């Protein structure tokens, strides 16, 4: 399930080759997991604690920090891997005609494999990060399901 590509995937905080007294069983083969509290009142989920995925851009198990703006949006498409596009619908005001117009500005955010219970239409919130790609700047902090989907 893991180690797909031409290089080893590891978390460069822990040491995965500690020498035990025996190197047998009963205390070994449970590797430690690196995680941190991202702050701003957000709570880390269990999937980032007991998971086995390896990332370098995950807000929980990764080398990226959260600072700046906190936004929200609705998930539109899940086609490209490990990152999704959300839609922000907002209203614009004109001084001349005292009437509003709705506008949308879709943009790409990053989805770690910690949140894999995501379908089209789920409301997510994002936080500003350093540029992780050409057009990707935001990391998803939590996921909220839409109406229905009771299964």
């Amino acid at each position: 399930d893991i180690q797909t590509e031409r290089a080893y995937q590891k978390q460069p905080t822990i040491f995965q080759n500690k020498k035990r007294v025996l190197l047998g069983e009963t205390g070994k083969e449970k590797l430690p997991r690196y995680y941190k509290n991202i702050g701003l009142g957000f709570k880390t989920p269990k999937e980032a604690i007991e998971g086995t995925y390896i990332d370098k851009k995950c807000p929980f198990t990764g080398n990226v920090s959260i600072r700046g703006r906190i936004l929200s949006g609705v998930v539109t498409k899940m086609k490209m891997q490990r990152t999704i596009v959300i839609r922000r619908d907002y209203l614009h005001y004109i001084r001349k005609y005292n009437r509003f117009e709705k506008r949308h500005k879709n943009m790409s955010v990053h989805l770690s494999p910690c949140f894999r219970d995501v379908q089209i239409g789920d409301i997510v919130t994002v936080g500003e990060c350093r540029p992780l790609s050409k057009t990707v700047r935001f990391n998803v902090l939590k996921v909220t399901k839409a109406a229905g989907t009771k299964k």
């Binding site: 702050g39 701003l40 009142g41 600072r67």
Partner: protein, 262 residues
């Protein structure tokens, strides 16, 4: 611009530099120092507009390098030296000292002080650092790196330093019930007591300050200077004690002074 700017236009100057328009094209850009450009005051501006000791830009230079003016116990020979909040300035020969405190409006004010009060200076700690061989460090709001401080000095406290030895004598803790004043913004020079301190994670932590007569206002965390422990101030406050008289009471006071003067 391929490099740093070296000129400064007259109408691009800050308003608290308190200049005129139809005098010259340029304004005195201060040399880099402890204080920022928009929050300091050049020595030429003070000596040529406030104290009226000099009239031109050469007389200020003659007085400045004549070794007559001492800045926080050190003689300075730069005519555009940045002087900011509670910069103790001394004239040794005529025996006068001035303390720079913001008055009831948004500006500086001349304030003659006794020499016994001119020996020390209240200043605000900015951040706490740890040195090379486990030495704690303090960074002060006028960039005074002090080695080995008191263990009870926190991030937003105020320390009192003797100008002859550079060490800490006494301190004020950041807590509600202490006399405070604001340095910057719409509020400036008002003296009040801290009551509330609202914590916002990831942004500016606003506080609430009540005046001694019944007025209240809210400023940011960076716009805080603690000056007293309770009601008694540790320094000599200027005239009016920083009460921020409104325009009606100011008009009434000016009319009363005009009627009494005749």
């Amino acid at each position: 611009a391929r490099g740093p700017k070296k000129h400064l236009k007259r109408v691009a100057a800050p308003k608290h530099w308190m200049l005129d328009k139809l005098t010259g094209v340029f304004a005195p850009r201060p040399s880099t120092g402890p204080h920022k450009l928009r929050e300091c005051l050049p020595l030429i501006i003070f000596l040529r507009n406030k104290l009226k000791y000099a009239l031109t830009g050469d007389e200020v230079k003659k007085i400045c390098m004549q070794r007559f003016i001492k800045i926080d116990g050190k003689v300075r020979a730069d005519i555009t030296y940045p002087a900011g909040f509670m910069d103790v300035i001394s004239i040794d020969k005529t025996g006068e000292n001035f303390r720079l405190i913001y008055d009831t409006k948004g500006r500086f004010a001349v304030h003659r002080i006794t020499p016994e009060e001119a020996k020390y200076k209240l200043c605000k700690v900015r951040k706490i650092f740890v040195g090379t061989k486990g030495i704690p460090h303090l960074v002060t709001h006028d960039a005074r790196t002090i080695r080995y401080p008191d263990p009870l000095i926190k991030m937003n406290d105020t320390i009192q330093i003797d100008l002859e030895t550079g060490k800490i004598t006494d301190f004020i803790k950041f807590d509600t019930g202490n006399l405070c004043m604001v340095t910057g913004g719409a509020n400036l020079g008002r003296i009040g007591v801290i009551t509330n301190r609202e914590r916002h994670p990831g942004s500016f932590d606003v506080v609430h300050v009540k005046d001694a007569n019944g007025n209240s206002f809210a400023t940011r965390l960076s716009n805080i200077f603690v000056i007293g422990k309770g009601n008694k101030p540790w320094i000599s406050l200027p005239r009016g004690k920083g009460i921020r008289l409104t325009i009606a009471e100011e008009r009434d006071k000016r009319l009363a002074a005009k009627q009494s003067s005749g």
